[PDB]
């Protein structure tokens, strides 16, 4: 129901988002993502199941010059990157994850240990064991990265990729067969719905059959729960003070004594009643939101809370609260993601085909080209540089950006316009 997570971030993940508040907002939304995904999924153990974070560790670019940090090396394989996180003592947490901004080869985004219901080790519910080769590793770990083929992945795919590797932690292998991978089915009704979470390959934007688990995944996770969550999972209750996120019942949350660099917040090591509470005379804390400074004051007007995006106009701070003002959209149907998708009401989803009443399709060196189609007929599937759509595009052939799914989600397209499986 509630499993106390421990999330880490390296300096590559901190450097991309460019303050500690930005990365904290990313890891806060990732936990709540898999919280909602797993709660709305019916598991055999109990009807619901959520997550909770117990502590965080935000490594900044100042830690790149730290000789004791093994994550400072820019070139680190995805297997050795997970092995580094395992070698730590994580017995106070059910699971422990580390988020990075590395471009792993062959389109690898996440990597986690498979959870065995019994007779093995790894995944969910595993304490540090001695094993072999003498290093005490904690196999209750997993990694994620937000860049693929030189392109940063959107948060929707980034939130799902968390839920995918956590599925292996919960004891779910990859989906197999037609009954649990409708994307490769010879039926238009099942193919439109798409594959599931535990699909072994690339996924992005279908949002119906891909966001939640499968009938196959529920069976495999059912055994791990019915035998391991009894001795592994903990209770639901009020949110803890010190996890770096501002929950209900607390006005601020900077962390513990050795983490809190906030002059506006009592750390988690302070006595009850003042821990995670605003210090007297102070009216905010950077842990609440990005719209307030270290001098504990609601930020002044005309300051960038949110920058102008493709489909989202800039949100601009002022002194009404500590949060961004919710961002609002610019003119509708503008081109986003380098002429690949459209801007309708604040989202860069779908494809560019929907701008003229068309749908994306798989071409049939041309796989990384955008192949549109007349609605509901895949036989009318022609390229953007075809003579069919010559009236609209005037001929310019829109190519898929690197890191985009291709050939019915069998791989990604690289910087050389090759659909690598």
């Amino acid at each position: 129901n509630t499993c106390q997570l421990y999330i880490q971030t390296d300096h590559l993940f901190f450097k991309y988002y460019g303050t500690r508040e930005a990365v904290i907002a990313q890891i806060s939304s990732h936990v709540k993502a898999i919280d909602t995904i797993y709660q709305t999924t019916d598991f055999s153990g109990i009807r619901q199941i959520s997550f909770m974070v117990k502590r965080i560790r935000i490594n900044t670019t100042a830690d790149e010059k730290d000789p004791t940090n093994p994550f400072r090396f820019p070139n680190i394989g995805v297997e050795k990157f997970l092995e580094l996180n395992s070698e730590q003592n994580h017995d106070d947490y059910c699971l422990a994850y580390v988020f990075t901004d590395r471009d792993f080869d062959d389109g690898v985004l996440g990597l986690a240990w498979v959870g065995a219901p019994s007779g093995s080790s790894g995944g969910i519910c595993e304490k540090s064991k001695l094993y072999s080769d003498g290093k005490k590793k904690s196999l209750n770990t997993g990694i994620i990265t937000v860049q693929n083929y030189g392109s940063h992945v959107p948060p929707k795919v980034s939130h799902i990729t968390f839920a995918h590797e956590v599925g292996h932690n919960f004891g779910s292998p990859h989906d197999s067969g037609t009954e649990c991978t409708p994307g490769e089915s010879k039926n238009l009704g099942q193919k439109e719905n798409g594959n599931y979470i535990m699909y072994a390959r690339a996924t992005s934007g279908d949002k119906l059959n891909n966001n939640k688990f499968s009938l196959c995944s529920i069976r495999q996770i059912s055994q791990v729960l019915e035998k391991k969550r009894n001795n592994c999972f903990v209770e639901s209750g009020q949110p803890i003070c010190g996890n770096g996120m501002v929950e209900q019942g607390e006005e601020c949350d900077c962390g513990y004594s050795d983490q809190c660099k906030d002059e506006c917040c009592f750390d988690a090591n302070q006595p009850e009643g003042r821990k995670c509470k605003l210090k007297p005379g102070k009216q905010c804390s950077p842990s609440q939101g990005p719209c307030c400074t270290a001098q504990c004051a609601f930020k002044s007007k005309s300051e960038k809370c949110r920058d102008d995006s493709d489909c989202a106009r800039e949100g601009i701070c002022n002194g009404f609260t500590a949060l961004c003002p919710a961002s609002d959209p610019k003119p509708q149907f503008t081109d986003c993601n380098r002429h690949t998708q459209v801007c309708i009401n604040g989202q860069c989803a779908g494809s560019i085909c929907e701008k003229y009443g068309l749908e994306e399709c798989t071409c049939a060196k041309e796989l990384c080209h955008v192949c549109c189609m007349k609605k509901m007929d895949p036989s009318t599937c022609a390229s953007t540089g075809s003579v069919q759509w010559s009236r609209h595009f005037s001929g310019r052939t829109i190519t898929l950006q690197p890191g985009s799914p291709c050939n019915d989600f069998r791989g990604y397209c690289d910087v050389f316009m090759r659909c690598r499986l």
Partner: antibody
Amino acid sequence: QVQLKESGPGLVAPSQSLSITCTVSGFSLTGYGVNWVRQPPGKGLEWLGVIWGDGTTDYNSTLKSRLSISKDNSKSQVFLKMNSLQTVDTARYYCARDGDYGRLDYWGQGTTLTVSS
Amino acid sequence: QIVLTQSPAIMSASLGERVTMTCTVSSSVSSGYLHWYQQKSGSSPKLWIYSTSNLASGVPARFSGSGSGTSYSLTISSMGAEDAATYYCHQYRRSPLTFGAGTKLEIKR
């Protein structure tokens, strides 16, 4: 157990500096705040300032010009410094721990301060 | 600036009588942050009631505290010979830290 003991000069002349040492015991100054409360002869409790476990300070509005509060976490000592002491600064200066929900659960014996020429 | 008005500022009571003190704050504070203290002549104050309704370690059961929002109370069920002192209410939920005016509880003869 928890102890607090303030070390003051006792008798100072007006227009002179002040320095009181609040030696504490039983707890760590990193997880508890320490308030300074003076009490004039025949009057009520009067707040001076406070230094938090993380090193942050909050002072009395009319005394921030002269008051100054620092501490030493390793030696369990909180320091109270004042400038341009007037004759009306004669009082008994206490230091008390800021406990759960800001309760002043443990007080010191207090040190008498007399300001007269 | 939060003010803590304490009334009655002067109380006379005989042995066995029942007294009730009051503190009215200028702005509503959470109940968990108001505390009462007892101070005798020539001695430092002692935490008496903490978190409004919780008696400190050692103070007798004849004491009690109630209140919420703006009004707060301190009640002695049976006035004893040892309860003649001055009582204060305390708040530091909001700056600055302020004490009450102080209630002088004198025993009546």
